[PDB]
Design an enzyme around this catalytic site. Structure first.
Site, short mmCIF file in Angstrom:
data_model
loop_
_atom_site.label_atom_id
_atom_site.label_comp_id
_atom_site.label_asym_id
_atom_site.label_seq_id
_atom_site.Cartn_x
_atom_site.Cartn_y
_atom_site.Cartn_z
N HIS A 52 0.70 -1.10 0.00
CA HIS A 52 -0.07 -0.10 -0.13
C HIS A 52 0.84 1.23 -0.11
O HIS A 52 0.67 2.04 0.84
CB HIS A 52 -1.06 0.06 1.27
CG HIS A 52 -1.96 -0.89 0.92
ND1 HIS A 52 -2.89 -0.84 2.37
CD2 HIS A 52 -2.64 -1.40 0.07
CE1 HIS A 52 -4.09 -1.81 1.81
NE2 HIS A 52 -3.82 -2.07 0.63
N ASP A 156 -5.52 -6.74 5.91
CA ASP A 156 -4.15 -6.50 5.83
C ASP A 156 -3.25 -7.53 6.09
O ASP A 156 -2.54 -8.05 5.26
CB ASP A 156 -3.59 -5.45 6.56
CG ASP A 156 -3.83 -3.89 5.90
OD1 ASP A 156 -4.48 -3.83 4.54
OD2 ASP A 156 -2.95 -2.86 6.12
N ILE A 373 -5.83 7.55 7.68
CA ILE A 373 -5.12 8.82 8.02
C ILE A 373 -5.88 10.40 7.53
O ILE A 373 -5.63 11.31 8.05
CB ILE A 373 -3.89 8.59 6.75
CG1 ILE A 373 -3.26 7.51 7.36
CG2 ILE A 373 -3.16 9.84 6.78
CD1 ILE A 373 -1.76 7.33 6.40
N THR A 374 -6.99 10.36 6.56
CA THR A 374 -7.59 11.40 6.11
C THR A 374 -8.44 11.81 7.60
O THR A 374 -8.64 12.88 7.79
CB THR A 374 -8.58 11.27 5.22
OG1 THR A 374 -7.85 10.69 3.78
CG2 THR A 374 -9.21 12.53 4.71
C1 LIG Z 1 -1.96 -2.29 10.46
C2 LIG Z 1 -2.38 -0.95 10.33
C3 LIG Z 1 -2.82 -0.65 8.98
C4 LIG Z 1 -3.18 0.76 8.63
N1 LIG Z 1 -3.39 0.92 7.14
C5 LIG Z 1 -3.92 2.28 7.00
C6 LIG Z 1 -4.15 2.66 5.39
O1 LIG Z 1 -3.91 1.69 4.46
N2 LIG Z 1 -4.64 3.71 5.21
C7 LIG Z 1 -4.98 4.73 6.17
O2 LIG Z 1 -5.32 5.64 5.95
N3 LIG Z 1 -4.87 4.32 7.42
C8 LIG Z 1 -4.39 3.31 7.94
N4 LIG Z 1 -3.89 2.91 9.15
C9 LIG Z 1 -4.54 3.81 10.17
C10 LIG Z 1 -3.43 5.18 10.49
O3 LIG Z 1 -2.02 4.13 10.69
C11 LIG Z 1 -3.79 5.85 11.61
O4 LIG Z 1 -4.99 6.34 11.38
C12 LIG Z 1 -2.60 6.73 12.18
O5 LIG Z 1 -1.47 6.33 12.25
C13 LIG Z 1 -3.06 7.54 13.23
O6 LIG Z 1 -2.02 8.54 13.75
P1 LIG Z 1 -1.56 8.86 15.13
O7 LIG Z 1 -0.91 10.42 15.16
O8 LIG Z 1 -2.83 8.86 16.27
O9 LIG Z 1 -0.88 7.96 15.77
P2 LIG Z 1 0.36 6.83 15.42
O10 LIG Z 1 0.73 6.74 14.00
O11 LIG Z 1 0.19 5.75 16.14
O12 LIG Z 1 1.51 7.58 16.02
C14 LIG Z 1 1.81 7.82 17.28
C15 LIG Z 1 3.11 8.20 17.57
O13 LIG Z 1 3.51 8.46 18.86
C16 LIG Z 1 4.86 7.69 19.24
N5 LIG Z 1 4.71 7.76 20.72
C17 LIG Z 1 4.11 6.76 21.65
N6 LIG Z 1 4.25 6.97 22.78
C18 LIG Z 1 5.09 7.99 22.90
C19 LIG Z 1 5.78 8.57 24.18
N7 LIG Z 1 5.52 8.47 25.35
N8 LIG Z 1 6.54 9.60 23.76
C20 LIG Z 1 6.84 10.14 22.47
N9 LIG Z 1 6.32 9.64 21.22
C21 LIG Z 1 5.41 8.24 21.57
C22 LIG Z 1 4.53 6.55 18.53
O14 LIG Z 1 5.82 5.74 18.52
C23 LIG Z 1 3.95 7.07 17.33
O15 LIG Z 1 5.25 7.32 16.12
C24 LIG Z 1 -3.52 1.61 9.53
C25 LIG Z 1 -3.38 1.47 10.89
C26 LIG Z 1 -3.12 -0.01 11.17
C27 LIG Z 1 -2.68 -0.24 12.74
#
Ligand SMILES: Cc1cc2nc3c(=O)[nH]c(=O)nc-3n(C[C@H](O)[C@H](O)[C@H](O)COP(=O)(O)OP(=O)(O)OC[C@H]3O[C@@H](n4cnc5c(N)ncnc54)[C@H](O)[C@@H]3O)c2cc1C
Ligand code: FES
EC number: 1.18.1.6
Lengths: 457, 113
Positions: A52, A156, A373-374
């Protein structure tokens, strides 16, 4: 004028989009992004499947943001551990929590610790190069694999498990996982859900990909879509097309070409409904998982707190690999920040953390692990905006604020060496080179100590 | 840019600009440096819905036939109308000059749950 010092905890989509919004809508605001991992982007790197790549393009926009003079990256810094939230609140005008939802929803059933039982997300981090999962080494020598939960994550891992290994050859999938996948004897994947078809959590894109996956055939029971036609014809746009694709696939006889394709298929994926995991059944020597006991359930107890409840009848399903993909939950990282253990998020009012002035949040730690992501992007913009709105109105700490000048000296005193975005770019360049030879986009560095050795750290 | 196109941003503001025929509206947006909150995240590869645009009826009718690949991403978009299309899938033509595309705003808080 004032020069806003804003701190973002987490470098995934929510953190980079919140920072993107802040930099775009305030010409003097500075954003420092903290990350516990050595590298940025969170789940765009570790979650999104290697087949992807198109989705991983948002990385180009984050890279652009990170390169802004008013943005800084600090990897290898685990907030709440190396630096506390209270300490960040003293250094910055505003602190935004965007650390996603790390914890995995345990099955909490007998034998859930038997070898062969993994978190679907651990399997994903395995092939996506998350360091903590590089030694997962799942045993793919068994024929059947059962996935609990019917979300996109389920599709996935089921897709990666049944995709002809060679088709993954030139993706950024770890060479380690690709090697394991080549020796895999997994040919049957069952995706089991507690509820019915009308409740599947996956999107039409990922489903379509599954229905057309080369070398596979679908296993859908027409009986699970009975007296369900009229409800599909009335569903909402997002739901309708998805359901019609399932109903079509589950009840319509394929054309001559399609049938020939399926008759030729050597692997298969299917969907099971109204089944909740009751227990993981052990092998003769009780050393590994040999199957899973599913309790037949009923829609009973409807309304807000609707849930499926076991009828008393069970069904034992043979399988050598059991993957749990039943959502996740964030976890508290600092006793200074409130936490809702039931919903698994940081209590907030549209971004404002409850009873903590200057503290905000965005992403999965704010709304829960249910957005692509959106979704995360437009949600993160709303948080960045409510923060800028509090700034204008004068509801954030007045005056000074040293920002990183203070935290840098602090992390230094504590012996914590941060990874800057430019350091990441040296690593990035290295992974890209290693991908040259094998013709892959990159070859991820999995060894924590080697990654640091590169950066000179 | 040989033709002109008007973009009605979410904040009412209008952003006029020209883009040479053949370019997708994402190209018109990107290269002209228009500030449209997170527009074209996947960079026009049918992996998101951030390039979602609401075209004029008299123009929607004669646009390239929409594919499933585009409908798949469009179903996940908010502020969906009967004249919606993914901007990066629409390449400019001579008859589009002076048209007006509207970026969907409204209440999308509904998608955050
Ligand atoms: C298996 C899987 C497949 C996916 N596939 C898709 C897809 O194809 N298309 C799509 O649009 N979305 C997809 N998603 C969803 C997408 O990944 C999430 O919507 C997105 O990552 C949400 O962002 P976030 O900022 O909340 O957190 P995240 O991306 O999880 O990031 C949180 C960040 O905080 C860091 N962190 C955690 N604790 C701490 C701390 N104490 N101090 C400092 N840093 C810290 C983590 O390491 C990380 O880098 C998928 C999700 C999963 C689990
Ligand atoms: S920019 Fe991603 S689908 Fe158009």
């Amino acid at each position: 004028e004032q020069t806003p010092q804003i701190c973002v905890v987490g470098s995934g989509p929510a953190g980079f989009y919140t920072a993107q919004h802040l930099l775009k809508h305030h010409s003097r605001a500075h954003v420092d992004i903290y990350e516990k991992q050595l590298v940025p982007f969170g789940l765009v790197r570790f979650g999104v499947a290697p087949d992807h790549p198109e989705v991983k393009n948002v990385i180009n926009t984050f890279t652009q943001t990170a390169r802004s003079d008013r943005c800084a990256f600090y990897g290898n810094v685990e907030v709440g551990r190396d630096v506390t939230v209270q300490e960040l609140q003293d250094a910055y005008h505003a602190v935004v929590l965007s650390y996603g939802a790390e914890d995995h929803q345990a099955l909490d059933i007998p034998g859930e610790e038997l070898p062969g039982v993994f978190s679907a997300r651990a399997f994903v981090g395995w092939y996506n190069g998350l360091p903590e999962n590089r030694e997962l080494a799942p045993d793919l020598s068994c024929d059947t694999a059962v996935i609990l939960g019917q979300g996109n994550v389920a599709l996935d891992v089921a897709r990666i498990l049944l995709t002809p290994p060679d088709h993954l050859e030139k993706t950024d999938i770890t060479e380690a996982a690709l090697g394991a996948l080549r020796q895999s004897r997994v040919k049957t994947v069952w995706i089991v859900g507690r509820r019915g078809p009308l409740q599947v959590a996956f999107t039409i894109k990922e489903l379509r990909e599954m229905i057309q996956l080369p070398g596979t055939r679908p296993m859908l029971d027409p009986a699970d879509f009975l007296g369900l036609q009229d409800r599909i014809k009335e569903a909402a746009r997002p739901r309708k097309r998805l359901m019609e694709l399932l109903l079509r696939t589950a009840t319509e006889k394929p054309g001559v070409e399609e049938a020939a394709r399926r008759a030729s298929a050597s692997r298969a994926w299917g969907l099971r409904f109204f089944r909740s995991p009751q227990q993981v059944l052990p092998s003769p020597d009780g050393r590994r998982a040999a199957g899973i006991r599913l309790a037949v359930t009923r829609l009973e107890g409807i309304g807000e707190a609707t849930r499926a409840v076991p009828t008393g009848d069970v069904e034992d399903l043979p399988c050598g690999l059991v993957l749990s993909s039943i959502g996740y939950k964030s976890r508290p990282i600092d006793p200074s920040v409130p936490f809702d253990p039931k919903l698994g998020v940081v209590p907030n009012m549209e971004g404002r953390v409850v009873d903590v002035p200057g503290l905000y949040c965005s992403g999965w730690v704010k709304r829960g692990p249910t957005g692509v992501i959106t979704t995360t992007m437009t949600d993160s913009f709303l948080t960045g905006q409510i923060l800028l709105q509090d700034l204008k109105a004068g509801h954030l700490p007045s005056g000074p604020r040293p920002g990183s000048a203070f935290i840098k000296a602090l992390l230094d005193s504590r012996g914590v060496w941060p990874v800057s975005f430019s350091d990441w770019e040296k690593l990035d360049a290295e992974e890209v080179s290693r991908g040259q030879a094998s013709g892959k986009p990159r070859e991820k560095l999995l060894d924590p100590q080697e990654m640091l050795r590169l950066l000179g750290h | 840019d040989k033709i002109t196109v008007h973009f009605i941003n979410r904040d009412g503001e209008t952003l006029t600009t020209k883009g040479k025929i053949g370019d997708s509206l994402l190209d018109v947006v990107v290269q002209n440096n228009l500030d449209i909150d997170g527009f074209g995240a996947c960079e026009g590869t049918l992996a998101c819905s951030t390039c979602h645009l609401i075209f004029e009826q008299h123009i929607f009718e004669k646009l390239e036939a929409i594919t499933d690949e585009e409908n798949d991403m469009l179903d996940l978009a908010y502020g969906l109308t009967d004249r919606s299309r993914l901007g990066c899938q629409i390449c400019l033509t001579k008859a589009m000059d002076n048209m007006t595309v509207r970026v969907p705003d409204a209440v999308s808080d509904a998608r955050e749950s």
